[PDB]
């Protein structure tokens, strides 16, 4: 079976390229605005540096 005609088909495909960049502040997330809590968070500072 040999074709005797043709069609020019345009297909659309979508690909995600990136996602929303995000940043997090340990101090104001965990220890919202209290100094007493933020002092206790210093010993865990390494974790946030991760």
């Amino acid at each position: 079976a040999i074709p005797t005609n043709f069609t020019i088909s345009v297909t659309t495909e979508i690909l995600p390229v990136s996602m929303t960049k995000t940043s997090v502040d340990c101090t104001m997330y965990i220890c919202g605005d209290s100094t007493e809590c933020s002092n206790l968070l210093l010993q865990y500072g390494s974790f946030c540096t991760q």
């Binding site: 100094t35 210093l42 500072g45 540096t49």
Partner: protein, 50 residues
């Protein structure tokens, strides 16, 4: 009177990043919350920023 001078400053609650050298003497420090550069040094736990 003699020829002596003195200076008075007031301590405040601050976070500091101190550097202990090989012989165990504090050779340098960074005042966290002094300026944005020292703030980044405080956040990244280093005395240099790339």
């Amino acid at each position: 009177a003699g020829a002596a001078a003195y200076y008075v400053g007031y301590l405040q609650p601050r976070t500091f990043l101190l550097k202990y050298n090989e012989n165990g003497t504090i050779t340098d420090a960074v005042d966290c919350a002094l300026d944005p550069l020292s703030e980044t040094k405080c956040t990244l736990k280093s005395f240099t920023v790339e």
